[PDB]
Short mmCIF file of C-alpha atoms in Angstrom, two decimals:
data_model
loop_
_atom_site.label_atom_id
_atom_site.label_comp_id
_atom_site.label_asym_id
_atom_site.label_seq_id
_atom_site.Cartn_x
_atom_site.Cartn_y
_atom_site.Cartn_z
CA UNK X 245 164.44 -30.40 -14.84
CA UNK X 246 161.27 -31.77 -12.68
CA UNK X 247 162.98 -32.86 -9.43
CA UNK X 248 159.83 -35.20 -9.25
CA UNK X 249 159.98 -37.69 -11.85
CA UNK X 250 161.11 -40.73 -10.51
CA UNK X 251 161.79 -44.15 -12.42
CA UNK X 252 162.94 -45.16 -16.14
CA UNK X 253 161.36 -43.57 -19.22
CA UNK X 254 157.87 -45.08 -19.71
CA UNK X 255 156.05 -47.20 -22.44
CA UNK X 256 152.38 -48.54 -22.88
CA UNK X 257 154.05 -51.89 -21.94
CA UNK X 258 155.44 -50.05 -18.96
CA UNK X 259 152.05 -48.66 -17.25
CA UNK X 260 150.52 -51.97 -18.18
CA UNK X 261 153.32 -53.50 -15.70
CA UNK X 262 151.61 -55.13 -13.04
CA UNK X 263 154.41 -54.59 -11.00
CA UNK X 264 156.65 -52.14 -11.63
CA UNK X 265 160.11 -50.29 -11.52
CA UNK X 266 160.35 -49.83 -8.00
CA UNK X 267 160.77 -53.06 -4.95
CA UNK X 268 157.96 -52.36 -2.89
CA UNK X 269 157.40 -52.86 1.13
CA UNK X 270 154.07 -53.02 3.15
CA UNK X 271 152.92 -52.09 6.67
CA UNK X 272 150.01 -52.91 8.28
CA UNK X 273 147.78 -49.50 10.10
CA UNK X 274 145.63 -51.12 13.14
CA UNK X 275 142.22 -50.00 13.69
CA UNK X 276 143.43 -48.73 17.07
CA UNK X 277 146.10 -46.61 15.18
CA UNK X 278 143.99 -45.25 12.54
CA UNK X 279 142.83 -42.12 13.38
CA UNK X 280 139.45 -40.96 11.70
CA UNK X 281 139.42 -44.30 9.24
CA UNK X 282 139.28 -47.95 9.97
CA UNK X 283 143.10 -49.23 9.18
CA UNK X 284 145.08 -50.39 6.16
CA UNK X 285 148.04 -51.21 4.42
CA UNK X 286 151.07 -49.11 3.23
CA UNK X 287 152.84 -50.15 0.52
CA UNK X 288 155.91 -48.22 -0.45
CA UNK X 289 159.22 -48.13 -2.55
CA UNK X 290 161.90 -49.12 -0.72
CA UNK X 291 164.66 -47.68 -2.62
CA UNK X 292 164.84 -44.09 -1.52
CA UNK X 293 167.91 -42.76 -3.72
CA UNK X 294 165.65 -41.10 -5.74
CA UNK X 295 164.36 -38.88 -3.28
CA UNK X 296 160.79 -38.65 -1.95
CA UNK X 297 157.18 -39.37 -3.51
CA UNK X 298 153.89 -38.98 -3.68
CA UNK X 299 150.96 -40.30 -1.84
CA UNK X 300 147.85 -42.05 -2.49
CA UNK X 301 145.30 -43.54 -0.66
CA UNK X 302 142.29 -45.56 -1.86
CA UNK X 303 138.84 -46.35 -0.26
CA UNK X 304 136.46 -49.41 -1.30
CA UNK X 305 132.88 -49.26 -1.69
CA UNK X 306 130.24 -49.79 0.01
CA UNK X 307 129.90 -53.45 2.33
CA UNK X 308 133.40 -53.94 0.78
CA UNK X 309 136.72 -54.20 2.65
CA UNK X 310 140.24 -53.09 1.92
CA UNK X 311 140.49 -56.35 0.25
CA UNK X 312 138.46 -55.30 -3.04
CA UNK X 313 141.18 -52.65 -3.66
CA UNK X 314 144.30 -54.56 -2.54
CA UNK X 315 145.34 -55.35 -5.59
CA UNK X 316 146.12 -51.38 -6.63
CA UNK X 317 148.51 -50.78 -3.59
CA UNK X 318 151.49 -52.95 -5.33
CA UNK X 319 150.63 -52.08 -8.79
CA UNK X 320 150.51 -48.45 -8.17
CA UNK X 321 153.50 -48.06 -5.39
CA UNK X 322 155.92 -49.98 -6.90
CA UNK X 323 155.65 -46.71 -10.02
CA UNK X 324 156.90 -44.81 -7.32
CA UNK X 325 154.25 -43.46 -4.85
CA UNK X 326 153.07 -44.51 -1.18
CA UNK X 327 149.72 -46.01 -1.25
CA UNK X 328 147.66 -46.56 1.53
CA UNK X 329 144.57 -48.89 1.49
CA UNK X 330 142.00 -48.19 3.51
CA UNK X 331 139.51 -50.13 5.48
CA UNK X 332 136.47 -47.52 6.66
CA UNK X 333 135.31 -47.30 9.83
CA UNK X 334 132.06 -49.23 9.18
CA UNK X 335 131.36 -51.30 5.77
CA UNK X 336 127.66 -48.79 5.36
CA UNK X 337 130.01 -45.91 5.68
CA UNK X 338 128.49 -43.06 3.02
CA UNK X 339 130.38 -41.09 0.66
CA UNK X 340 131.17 -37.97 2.45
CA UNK X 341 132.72 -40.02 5.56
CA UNK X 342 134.48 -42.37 3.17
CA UNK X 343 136.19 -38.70 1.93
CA UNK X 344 136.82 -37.62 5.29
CA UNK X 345 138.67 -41.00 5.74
CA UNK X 346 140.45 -40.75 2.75
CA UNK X 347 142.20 -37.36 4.03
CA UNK X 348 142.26 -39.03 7.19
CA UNK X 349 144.66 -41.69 5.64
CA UNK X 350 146.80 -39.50 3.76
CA UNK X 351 147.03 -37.57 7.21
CA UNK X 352 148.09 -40.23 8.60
CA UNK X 353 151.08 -41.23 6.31
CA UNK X 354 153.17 -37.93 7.65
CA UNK X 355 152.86 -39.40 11.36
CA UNK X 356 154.03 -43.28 10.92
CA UNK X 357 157.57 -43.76 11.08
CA UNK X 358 157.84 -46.30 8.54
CA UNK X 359 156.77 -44.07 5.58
CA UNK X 360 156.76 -40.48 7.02
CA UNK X 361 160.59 -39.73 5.35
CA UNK X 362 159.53 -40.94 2.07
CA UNK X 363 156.72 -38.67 1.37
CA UNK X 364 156.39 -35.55 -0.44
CA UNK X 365 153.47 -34.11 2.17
CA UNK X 366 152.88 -31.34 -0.59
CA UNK X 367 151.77 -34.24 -3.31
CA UNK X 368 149.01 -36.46 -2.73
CA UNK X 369 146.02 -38.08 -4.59
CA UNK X 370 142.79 -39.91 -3.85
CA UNK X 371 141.09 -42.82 -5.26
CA UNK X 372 137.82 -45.20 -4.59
CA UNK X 373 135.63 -47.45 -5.78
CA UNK X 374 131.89 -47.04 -5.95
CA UNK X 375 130.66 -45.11 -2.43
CA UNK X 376 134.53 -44.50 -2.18
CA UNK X 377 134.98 -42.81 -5.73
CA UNK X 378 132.41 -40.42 -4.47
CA UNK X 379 134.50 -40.04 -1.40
CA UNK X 380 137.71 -39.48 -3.55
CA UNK X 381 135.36 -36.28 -4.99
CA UNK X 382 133.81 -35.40 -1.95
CA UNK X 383 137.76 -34.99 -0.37
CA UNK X 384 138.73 -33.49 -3.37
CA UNK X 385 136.07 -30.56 -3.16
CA UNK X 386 137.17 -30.25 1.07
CA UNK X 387 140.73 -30.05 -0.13
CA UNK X 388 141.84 -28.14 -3.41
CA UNK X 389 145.36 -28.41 -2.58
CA UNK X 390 145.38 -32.70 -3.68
CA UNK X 391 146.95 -33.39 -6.75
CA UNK X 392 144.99 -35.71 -8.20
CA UNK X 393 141.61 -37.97 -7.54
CA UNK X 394 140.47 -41.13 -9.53
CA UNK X 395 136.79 -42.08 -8.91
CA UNK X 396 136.26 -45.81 -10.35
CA UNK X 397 132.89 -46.04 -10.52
CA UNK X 398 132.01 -43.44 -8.17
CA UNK X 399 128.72 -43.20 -6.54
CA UNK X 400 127.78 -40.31 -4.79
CA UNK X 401 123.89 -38.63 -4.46
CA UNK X 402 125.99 -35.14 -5.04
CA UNK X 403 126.10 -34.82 -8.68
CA UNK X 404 127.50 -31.27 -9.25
CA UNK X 405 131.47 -31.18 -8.72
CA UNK X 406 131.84 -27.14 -9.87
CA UNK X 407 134.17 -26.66 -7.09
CA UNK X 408 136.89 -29.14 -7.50
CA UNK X 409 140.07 -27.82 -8.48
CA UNK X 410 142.09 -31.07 -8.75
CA UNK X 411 143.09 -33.14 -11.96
CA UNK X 412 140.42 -35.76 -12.19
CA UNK X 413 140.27 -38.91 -14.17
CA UNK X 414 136.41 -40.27 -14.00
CA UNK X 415 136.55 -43.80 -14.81
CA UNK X 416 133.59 -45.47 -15.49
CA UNK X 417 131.75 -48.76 -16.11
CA UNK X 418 130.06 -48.78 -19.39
CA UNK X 419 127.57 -51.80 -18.00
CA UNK X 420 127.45 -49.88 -14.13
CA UNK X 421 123.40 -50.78 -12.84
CA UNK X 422 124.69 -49.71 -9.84
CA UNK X 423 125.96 -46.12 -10.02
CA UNK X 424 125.12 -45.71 -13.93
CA UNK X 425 127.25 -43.48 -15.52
CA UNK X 426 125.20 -41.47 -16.80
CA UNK X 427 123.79 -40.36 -13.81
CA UNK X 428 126.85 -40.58 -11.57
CA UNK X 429 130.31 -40.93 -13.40
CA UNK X 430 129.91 -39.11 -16.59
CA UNK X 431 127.59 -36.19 -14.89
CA UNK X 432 130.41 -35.48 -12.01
CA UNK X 433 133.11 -35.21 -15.38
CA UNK X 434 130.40 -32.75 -17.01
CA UNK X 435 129.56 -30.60 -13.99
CA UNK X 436 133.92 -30.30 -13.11
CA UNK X 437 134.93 -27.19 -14.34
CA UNK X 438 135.50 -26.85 -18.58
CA UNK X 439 138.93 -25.45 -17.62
CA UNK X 440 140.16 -28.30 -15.19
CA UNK X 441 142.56 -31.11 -16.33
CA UNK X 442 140.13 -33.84 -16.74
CA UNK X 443 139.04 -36.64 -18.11
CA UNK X 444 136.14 -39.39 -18.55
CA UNK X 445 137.46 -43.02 -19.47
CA UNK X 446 134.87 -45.35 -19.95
CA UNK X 447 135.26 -49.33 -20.09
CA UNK X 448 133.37 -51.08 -22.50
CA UNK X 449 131.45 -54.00 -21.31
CA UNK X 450 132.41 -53.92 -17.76
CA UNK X 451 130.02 -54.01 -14.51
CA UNK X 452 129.79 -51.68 -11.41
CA UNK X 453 132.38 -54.48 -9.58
CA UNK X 454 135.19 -54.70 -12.22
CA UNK X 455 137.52 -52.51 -9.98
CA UNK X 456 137.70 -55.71 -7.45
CA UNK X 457 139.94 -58.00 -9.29
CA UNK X 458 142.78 -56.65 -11.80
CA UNK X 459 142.14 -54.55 -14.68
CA UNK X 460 145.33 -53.70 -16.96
CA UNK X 461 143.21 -50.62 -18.34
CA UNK X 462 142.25 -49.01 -14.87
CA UNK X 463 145.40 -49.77 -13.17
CA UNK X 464 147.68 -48.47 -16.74
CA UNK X 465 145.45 -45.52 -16.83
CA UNK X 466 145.49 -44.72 -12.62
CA UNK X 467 149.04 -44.91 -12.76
CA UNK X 468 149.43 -42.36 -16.61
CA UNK X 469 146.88 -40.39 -14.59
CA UNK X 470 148.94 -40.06 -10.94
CA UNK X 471 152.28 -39.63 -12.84
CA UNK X 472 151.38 -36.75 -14.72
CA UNK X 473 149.96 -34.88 -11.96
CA UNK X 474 151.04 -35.82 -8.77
CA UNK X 475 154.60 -35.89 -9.79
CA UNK X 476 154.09 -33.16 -13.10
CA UNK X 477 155.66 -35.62 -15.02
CA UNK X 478 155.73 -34.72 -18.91
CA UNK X 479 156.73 -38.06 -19.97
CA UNK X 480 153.36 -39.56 -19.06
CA UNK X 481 151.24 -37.04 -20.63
CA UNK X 482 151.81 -39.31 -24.02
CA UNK X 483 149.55 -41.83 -22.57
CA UNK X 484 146.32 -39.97 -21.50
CA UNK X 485 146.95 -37.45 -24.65
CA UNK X 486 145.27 -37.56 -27.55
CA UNK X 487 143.16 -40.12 -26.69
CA UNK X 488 144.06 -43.69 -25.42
CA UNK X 489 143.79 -46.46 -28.27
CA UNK X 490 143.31 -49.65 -25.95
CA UNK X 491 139.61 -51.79 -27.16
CA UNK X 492 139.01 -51.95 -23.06
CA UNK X 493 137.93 -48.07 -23.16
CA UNK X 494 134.41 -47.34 -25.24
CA UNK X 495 134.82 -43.77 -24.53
CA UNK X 496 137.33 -41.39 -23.82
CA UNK X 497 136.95 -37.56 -23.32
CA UNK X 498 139.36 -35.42 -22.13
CA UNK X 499 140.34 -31.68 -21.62
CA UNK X 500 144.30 -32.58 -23.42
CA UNK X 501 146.04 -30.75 -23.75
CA UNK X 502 147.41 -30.92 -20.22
CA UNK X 503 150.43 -29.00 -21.19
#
């Protein structure tokens, strides 16, 4: 058996949830107790007889405060990870920093009392929007041992990822004037390596700001995505393989199978 599935069997309807299985918590990081990012929140499952999980932490974009990506830290923790939003250190911040900030969070999480017992330290995942997707790559390529990174919309002037060895899901804006996909998004999914679990999800219609305010798709998809990989769970690989059905996505490509 994998020791790290956690929750009830899943369904589309499931992922969709916009909140989920697990009762969820939240406390607040100070800037003053951030070390090497500019504070957030932690939201976490509070309901621990199922043992530990995984981590997450997510960056916004750039000018753009923790409260552009707020909405994710519910949805996703109460699935069964601890998510920590991050503010950066300044709102011009750059990719690169945003990444070191992003490992800076997850450091963090093993340190504060509040969440450090209910973490898996070996299992943890990065996300951002727009400068702070390209963070999410630029900490995956510094650290090869996360399990998982979700650009959403990513932005980054480094376009050639041939070094990342972590499960990526590129999800991109088909409408993005700001960080077009096909000079950001869908080039970073083409220059990952052939043989990495990967894939580009693409949503039809939407703008470079669609990550700040709900979307069913990115949030169904984020969680499918962090499930099967963070936690190896099997029982999510239904979801991201063979392709996703939903109208929302315009284009899907993938390297399933993932088992």
């Amino acid at each position: 058996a994998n020791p790290y599935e956690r929750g009830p069997d899943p369904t589309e309807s499931s992922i969709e949830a916009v909140r989920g299985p697990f009762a969820v918590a939240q406390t607040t990081v100070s800037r003053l107790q951030a070390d090497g990012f500019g504070g957030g929140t932690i939201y976490y499952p509070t309901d621990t007889s199922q043992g530990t999980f995984g981590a997450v932490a997510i960056s916004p974009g750039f000018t753009a405060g923790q409260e552009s990506i707020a909405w994710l830290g519910p949805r996703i923790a109460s699935q069964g990870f601890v998510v920590i939003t991050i503010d950066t250190i300044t709102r011009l911040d750059q990719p690169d920093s945003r990444g070191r900030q992003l490992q800076a969070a997850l450091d963090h999480l093993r340190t504060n009392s509040v969440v450090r017992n209910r973490i898996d330290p070996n299992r943890m995942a990065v996300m951002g929007h727009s400068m702070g997707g390209g963070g999410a790559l630029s900490a995956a390529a510094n650290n090869t041992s996360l399990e998982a990174a979700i650009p959403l919309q990513g932005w980054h002037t480094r376009k050639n990822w041939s070094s990342v060895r972590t499960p990526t899901l590129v999800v991109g804006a088909e409408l993005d004037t700001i960080a077009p996909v096909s000079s950001h998004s869908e080039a970073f999914y083409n220059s990952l390596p052939s043989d990495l679990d990967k894939a580009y999800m693409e949503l039809r219609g939407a703008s470079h700001t669609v990550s700040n305010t709900p979307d069913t798709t990115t949030a169904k998809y984020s969680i499918a995505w962090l499930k099967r990989f963070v936690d190896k769970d099997l029982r999510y690989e239904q979801f991201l393989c063979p392709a996703p059905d939903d109208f929302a996505i315009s284009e899907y490509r993938s390297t399933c199978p993932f088992l």
